[PDB]
Amino acid sequence: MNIFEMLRIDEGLRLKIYKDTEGYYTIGIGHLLTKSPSLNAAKSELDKAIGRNTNGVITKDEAEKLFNQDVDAAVRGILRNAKLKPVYDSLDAVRRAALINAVFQMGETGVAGFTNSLRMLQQKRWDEAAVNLAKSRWYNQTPNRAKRVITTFRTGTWDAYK
Ligand SMILES: [Cl-]
Ligand SMILES: [Cl-]
């Protein structure tokens, strides 16, 4: 199991523009296109991301390319973030993947806002961090996914994905 397989499971793969859990235009493997309510805006952003006139449809290869880019951007964002880098550096490999997952889903800023949880992860207080992370909109809106990520931080293994 690895970060790629992990996010492929949580985000799925769709080759046509679709709406995410929040109602935003998305494509591929969780690649957010725009927060704008307009499909055209979405099509415009897609074309600009792929580099061709896409008609709102892409290929598997294209979806994987966006995916590679997005994972890469997520890692780089953590490393450049003052609040995140220290947490990430303190973690083992499995838990690092779980932090990447969260950033991918909610953005660097979003994750950085979980001050208290961040402190608990850094101190290695697994069970306590897990309880605190559950007290969030994130968990109430996407409970199955949040539970998987949270278990990953609690145990340090991939059991939730197996
Ligand atoms: Cl892009
Ligand atoms: Cl869910």
Side-chain angles (χ1 to χ4, degrees):
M1 174 76 67
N2 63 54
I3 183 61
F4 287 98
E5 291 181 14
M6 186 203 208
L7 279 164
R8 169 94 170 55
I9 284 168
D10 286 329
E11 295 288 347
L13 173 64
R14 310 182 60 186
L15 303 187
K16 352 203 115 147
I17 291 183
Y18 68 94
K19 291 223 219 196
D20 69 4
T21 64
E22 312 268 355
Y24 301 138
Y25 282 121
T26 301
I27 190 140
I29 300 164
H31 181 90
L32 170 77
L33 296 171
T34 181
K35 295 194 170 151
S36 171
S38 171
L39 181 69
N40 302 292
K43 292 164 147 160
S44 174
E45 293 284 319
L46 178 57
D47 290 340
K48 157 164 83 82
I50 299 304
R52 68 189 183 65
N53 243 68
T54 58
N55 170 64
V57 178
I58 61 173
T59 71
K60 195 154 176 136
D61 269 56
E62 279 167 346
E64 280 164 357
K65 188 180 243 233
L66 290 180
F67 190 36
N68 278 324
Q69 289 171 177
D70 291 344
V71 168
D72 201 50
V75 181
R76 295 277 267 137
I78 283 169
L79 302 171
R80 288 186 168 121
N81 188 292
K83 292 198 68 199
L84 298 181
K85 175 183 154 48
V87 182
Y88 184 87
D89 286 345
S90 75
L91 300 167
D92 49 273
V94 179
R95 294 188 172 88
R96 279 176 186 178
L99 190 65
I100 293 158
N101 192 305
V103 173
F104 184 100
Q105 181 190 3
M106 59 191 147
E108 134 184 49
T109 297
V111 180
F114 284 60
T115 310
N116 308 326
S117 294
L118 290 173
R119 175 195 83 249
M120 292 161 212
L121 289 167
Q122 207 173 335
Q123 290 176 328
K124 313 199 176 293
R125 296 162 103 94
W126 318 127
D127 288 48
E128 313 171 43
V131 163
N132 188 260
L133 289 168
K135 298 198 239 114
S136 62
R137 173 187 201 275
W138 168 54
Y139 180 88
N140 283 103
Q141 297 307 126
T142 55
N144 291 322
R145 165 167 197 174
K147 204 139 355 191
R148 287 197 289 274
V149 165
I150 288 172
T151 293
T152 300
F153 279 116
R154 209 183 35 93
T155 65
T157 67
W158 292 115
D159 308 323
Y161 286 88
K162 310 171 301 224

